[PDB]
Amino acid sequence: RPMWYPGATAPAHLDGSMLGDYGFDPLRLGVNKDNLKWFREAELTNGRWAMAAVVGILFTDAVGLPKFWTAGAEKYALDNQTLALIEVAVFAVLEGKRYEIYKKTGETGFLSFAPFDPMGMKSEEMKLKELKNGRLAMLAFLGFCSQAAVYGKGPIETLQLHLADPGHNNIYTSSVGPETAVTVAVLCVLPMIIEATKTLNPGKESVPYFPWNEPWN
Amino acid sequence: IEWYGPDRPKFLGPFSEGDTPAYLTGEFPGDYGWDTAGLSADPETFKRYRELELIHARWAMLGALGCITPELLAKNGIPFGEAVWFKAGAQIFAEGGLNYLGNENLIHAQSIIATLAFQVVVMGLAEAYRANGGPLGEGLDPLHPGGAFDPLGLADDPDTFAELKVKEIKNGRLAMFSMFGFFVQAIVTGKGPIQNLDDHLANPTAVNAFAYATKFTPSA
Amino acid sequence: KKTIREKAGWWSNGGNEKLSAFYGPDRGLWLGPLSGTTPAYLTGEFPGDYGWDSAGLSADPETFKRYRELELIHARWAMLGALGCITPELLAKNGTPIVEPVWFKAGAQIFAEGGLDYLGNPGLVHAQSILATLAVQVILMGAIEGYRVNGGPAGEGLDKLHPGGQFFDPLGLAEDPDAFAELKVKEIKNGRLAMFSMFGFFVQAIVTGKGPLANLDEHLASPFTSNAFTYAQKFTPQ
Numbered sequence: 001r002p003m004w005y006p007g008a009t010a011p012a013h014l015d016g017s018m019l020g021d022y023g024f025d026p027l028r029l030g031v032n033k034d035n036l037k038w039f040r041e042a043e044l045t046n047g048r049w050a051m052a053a054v055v056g057i058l059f060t061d062a063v064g065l066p067k068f069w070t071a072g073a074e075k076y077a078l079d080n081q082t083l084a085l086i087e088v089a090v091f092a093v094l095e096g097k098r099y100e101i102y103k104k105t106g107e108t109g110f111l112s113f114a115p116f117d118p119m120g121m122k123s124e125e126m127k128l129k130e131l132k133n134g135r136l137a138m139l140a141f142l143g144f145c146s147q148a149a150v151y152g153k154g155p156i157e158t159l160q161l162h163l164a165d166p167g168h169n170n171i172y173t174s175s176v177g178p179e180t181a182v183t184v185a186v187l188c189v190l191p192m193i194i195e196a197t198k199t200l201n202p203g204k205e206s207v208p209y210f211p212w213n214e215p216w217n
Numbered sequence: 218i219e220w221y222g223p224d225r226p227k228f229l230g231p232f233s234e235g236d237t238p239a240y241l242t243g244e245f246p247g248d249y250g251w252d253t254a255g256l257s258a259d260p261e262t263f264k265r266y267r268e269l270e271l272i273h274a275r276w277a278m279l280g281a282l283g284c285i286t287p288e289l290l291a292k293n294g295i296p297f298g299e300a301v302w303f304k305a306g307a308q309i310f311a312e313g314g315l316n317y318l319g320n321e322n323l324i325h326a327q328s329i330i331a332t333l334a335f336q337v338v339v340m341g342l343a344e345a346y347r348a349n350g351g352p353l354g355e356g357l358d359p360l361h362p363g364g365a366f367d368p369l370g371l372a373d374d375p376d377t378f379a380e381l382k383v384k385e386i387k388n389g390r391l392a393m394f395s396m397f398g399f400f401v402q403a404i405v406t407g408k409g410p411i412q413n414l415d416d417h418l419a420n421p422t423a424v425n426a427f428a429y430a431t432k433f434t435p436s437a
Numbered sequence: 438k439k440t441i442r443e444k445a446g447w448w449s450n451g452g453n454e455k456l457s458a459f460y461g462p463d464r465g466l467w468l469g470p471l472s473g474t475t476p477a478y479l480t481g482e483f484p485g486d487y488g489w490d491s492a493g494l495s496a497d498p499e500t501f502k503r504y505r506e507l508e509l510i511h512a513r514w515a516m517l518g519a520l521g522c523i524t525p526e527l528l529a530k531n532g533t534p535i536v537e538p539v540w541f542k543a544g545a546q547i548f549a550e551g552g553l554d555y556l557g558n559p560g561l562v563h564a565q566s567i568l569a570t571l572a573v574q575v576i577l578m579g580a581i582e583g584y585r586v587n588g589g590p591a592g593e594g595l596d597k598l599h600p601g602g603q604f605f606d607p608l609g610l611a612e613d614p615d616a617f618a619e620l621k622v623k624e625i626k627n628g629r630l631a632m633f634s635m636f637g638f639f640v641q642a643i644v645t646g647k648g649p650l651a652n653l654d655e656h657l658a659s660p661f662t663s664n665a666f667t668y669a670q671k672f673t674p675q
């Protein structure tokens with residue numbers, strides 16, 4: 001199967017049993033199986049929320065609406081504390097049904113339909129598509145917020161700025177230019193160090209000595 | 218369309234398989250399966266309510282025609298001192314009394330007490346005869362006697378009889394609905410039915426009932 | 438016979454004698470200790486059975502069933518209505534700019550040319566046509582109630598009053614049959630209270646002419662000063 005860098009060797013717990021498995025767990029956060037299931041569900045939840053948020057931001061910036069980092073400041077039909085209370089009350093029960101549904105199913109559901117699947121499109125191909133689009137949309141929202149904090153422009157306005165001058169209007173000419181250039185170079189040279197570790201210890205796994213890993217076993 | 222039996226037309230249409238009670242077999246005319254209130258669970262109460270329905274229906278058909286006709290004739294040229302139906306009774310207190318078609322020579326009624334007295338006498342006689350029979354019937358049906366009430370003979374075949382029963386009760390339910398409407402929209406509008414139709418046809422979107430919606434608000 | 442903490446009502450899941458006050462022979466009745474001969478057909482099997490059939494209208498079991506369904510549906514509609522006839526006025530006296538929060542005048546908001554803004558916010562529903570509103574409503578409620586009476590996309594082989602699939606009991610509050618049995622009573626009692634209070638809303642409109650919360654406020658200002666007897670001579674025949 002493909003990996004996160006070409007010719008990588010997955011850890012012992014990323015057996016490919018799960019979907020979207022590319023052997024990426026360098027900090028070994030998912031060596032426990034219960035933690036790994038919970039993290040798969042949290043990955044999918046953050047991804048669903050990020051997908052909805054990405055399309056909402058793209059919509060509100062495509063049309064004549066305030067920018068998404070200022071929309072909370074605008075004036076609405078209800079005051080912000082009443083909104084927060086109704087949101088807390090609704091999501092208590094909603095996420096409680098979702099938590100019960102995770103404890104029972106191990107997967108997602110809305111309230112009582114353990115799988116929320118009126119239209120029976122629950123393949124595992126569709127689970128893989130959900131996970132991949134969710135990772136992509138998590139990155140997309142992180143980028144929305146990041147390049148709306150670096151500039152004061154929305155997503156597609158920054159896109160237009162890039163397309164106006166791609167060589168000079170990019171992340172490496174921004175306020176965060178040098179740190180991102182350095183981290184990109186470090187990331188590109190990182191897999192050669194990882195492959196050195198894999199090469200000099202053929203078929204052996206090294207514990208990185210972290211708290212969550214229980215590396216003494 | 219059957220009008221009888223289990224595969225009869227019903228009052229919620231396709232939505233009506235499990236709403237009809239067990240006692241509303243498709244035996245009687247107009248049985249669309251509407252007894253949500255369960256008021257006809259007892260067969261005897263059901264029979265009495267059927268009689269009430271049919272008599273109200275016939276009286277309401279006559280009354281619907283009697284409220285529509287004078288107004289039509291009123292604009293189509295004929296003098297009608299008070300054509301509107303909910304003041305047609307107050308003609309007795311006019312100068313010349315209640316002239317039938319406007320003709321001072323037709324009836325020329327002046328006293329409402331005598332009119333009412335004759336009405337009670339003959340209506341009581343007729344309704345008593347209706348209940349238990351008389352000169353036009355001894356042991357006939359309480360609802361469809363026939364004989365003296367079929368000089369034309371429309372319903373000697375049972376199938377024609379059944380379909381005309383359904384037609385009767387349905388025109389009658391229509392007339393009862395329409396007469397209820399006459400009442401409520403006379404109280405609300407204060408004009409006749411034909412004038413209400415004319416006003417609705419003149420401006421349908423701003424001459425409807427919702428124009429008279431804020432009429433009965435208490436407002437302290 | 439018990440200990441202090443069982444008297445004080447601790448230890449949930451001890452409920453089989455707590456249904457005795459709402460079901461069964463020796464339950465609470467409509468005149469309490471002054472209602473001896475309950476109708477034989479009010480056996481205490483259905484929720485809200487207080488033995489009240491003074492008029493004997495539910496003597497037939499099938500019309501009793503139909504009347505039970507009428508009662509519960511009226512109760513649910515009246516609960517929604519009692520909440521909806523006070524929510525706008527409360528929200529307006531708290532400061533939301535609703536243009537007519539009084540309930541018997543709330544329908545006349547759609548004839549103002551600014552339309553029927555929902556919470557007084559024009560960016561919201563902004564309905565102008567009462568006829569289009571009514572048409573939408575008729576279509577939707579006809580589908581909805583025809584689905585209610587025989588079945589529909591939300592379950593067909595379910596109970597006529599308490600379907601309780603995944604669409605109408607999505608929180609699963611009624612999976613315990615004893616919790617279900619006592620929640621039925623809570624439903625019907627809150628609903629009878631709401632029906633009585635909606636009759637009260639109707640009569641307090643026709644009589645008083647103000648809002649129900651305004652009536653509460655002017656009663657709490659000086660109760661003996663202002664009451665329903667204040668408006669007793671209002672319907673004087675002149």
Ligand code: CHL
Nearest residue numbers: 226227228229230231232249251390571574575579580583
């Ligand atoms: C599947 C679609 C379908 C639907 C939804 C209905 C629905 C209805 N049919 Mg039916 N039918 C349908 C198909 C068919 N019907 C019939 C044949 C019949 C007949 C013969 C009859 C019916 C009747 C009825 C009504 C009985 C329920 C009722 O009384 O409402 C009660 C609920 C209300 C009245 C709520 C009000 C609705 C609206 C929103 C009112 C507006 C509110 C006001 C502003 C409030 C006023 C404020 C005041 C208080 C101040 C109801 C409207 C009966 C009828 O006409 O009675 C009225 C009737 O006699 N149908 C046939 C031929 C086989 C059908 C074919 O598919």
Ligand code: CLA
Nearest residue numbers: 139140142143146147150158159161162169170171172174
């Ligand atoms: C899929 C996500 C995605 C996409 C399509 C873009 C696209 C863009 N970004 Mg954004 N960005 C992202 C994620 C993304 N970014 C994230 C996660 C961050 C946080 C680190 C940022 C932070 C950021 C800043 C601070 C700036 C941009 C800028 C730009 C523009 C120039 C490209 C550049 O220098 O950025 C390179 C982006 C990175 C190094 C961040 C990581 C990007 C990951 C690796 C995804 C790469 C793309 C992916 C593999 C495939 C794309 C899918 C599809 C759309 C084709 C371009 C419109 C610049 C701009 O607006 O110029 C006018 C700018 O100043 N971005």
Ligand code: CLA
Nearest residue numbers: 394398401402405406413414416417424425426429571572
């Ligand atoms: C079939 C019988 C029938 C007919 C032909 C009419 C016709 C009319 N009525 Mg009358 N009415 C009827 C029955 C009828 N009504 C009944 C039973 C009631 C008692 C609830 C009323 C109460 C009533 C009042 C209080 C008023 C009218 C008025 C009117 C006129 C305007 C229409 C209107 O406001 O709608 C109102 C209609 C109703 C309140 C209920 C009737 C139900 C109909 C027959 C079913 C729906 C059919 C419709 C085409 C579908 C619309 C779908 C969607 C928009 C809801 C119009 C001439 C108004 C008037 O005089 O304007 C000049 C007026 O003020 N009517």
Ligand SMILES: CCCCCCCCCCCCCCCC(=O)OC[C@H](COP(=O)(O)OC[C@@H](O)CO)OC(=O)CCCCCCCCCCCCCCC
Nearest residue numbers: 028029030031032033034035210211212213214215216217
């Ligand atoms: C960015 C900032 C810097 C981040 C550094 C890294 C963060 C580490 C996050 C650890 C997540 C939890 C680990 C899961 C736990 C886990 O995986 O257990 C693994 C390990 C112990 O293993 P056990 O033998 O208990 O495991 C057996 C069980 O797993 C059952 O088999 O954890 C520890 O040794 C203790 C770690 C405590 C870590 C929390 C310390 C709290 C720090 C905050 C202090 C605040 C002080 C001020 C208060 C006002």
Ligand SMILES: CC(/C=C/C=C(C)/C=C/[C@@]12O[C@]1(C)C[C@@H](O)CC2(C)C)=C\C=C\C=C(C)\C=C\C=C(C)\C=C\[C@@]12O[C@]1(C)C[C@@H](O)CC2(C)C
Nearest residue numbers: 025026027028029046049050053056068071138139141142
């Ligand atoms: C990016 C992201 C997560 C990235 C995680 C990564 C890379 C994890 C990497 C690793 O862990 C692994 C894999 C393995 C480990 O061994 C190694 C590391 C490296 C540690 C999550 C985003 C998660 C993003 C989410 C959940 C976004 C939700 C967005 C919402 C709700 C937006 C809401 C709004 O924006 C709108 C819609 C409109 C506005 O007007 C109003 C508001 C409210 C502002």
Ligand SMILES: CC1=C[C@H](O)CC(C)(C)[C@H]1/C=C/C(C)=C/C=C/C(C)=C/C=C/C=C(C)/C=C/C=C(C)/C=C/C1=C(C)C[C@H](O)CC1(C)C
Nearest residue numbers: 251252253254273276277280283284302305393394396397
């Ligand atoms: C079915 C069902 C079912 C469920 O179960 C329950 C329920 C719901 C209850 C049910 C329902 C019911 C109903 C709806 C009913 C209705 C009724 C009516 C409307 C009647 C009318 C009714 C009506 C009627 C009679 C009418 C009549 C009429 C008349 C006489 C008239 C007279 C007159 C005229 C000509 C005019 C002139 O100038 C004068 C006068 C003298 C005035």
Ligand SMILES: CC1=C[C@H](O)CC(C)(C)[C@H]1/C=C/C(C)=C/C=C/C(C)=C/C=C/C=C(C)/C=C/C=C(C)/C=C/C1=C(C)C[C@H](O)CC1(C)C
Nearest residue numbers: 489490491492493514515518521522540543632633635636
């Ligand atoms: C038991 C018994 C016994 C013996 O034997 C006999 C007898 C006596 C007969 C019996 C009794 C009975 C009774 C008492 C009854 C009652 C009823 C009621 C009250 C109802 C209500 C009922 C009520 C109801 C439904 C209500 C409803 C409501 C609603 C919908 C609402 C709506 C609305 C709102 C929100 C507001 C807005 O703005 C408007 C409107 C539109 C207005």
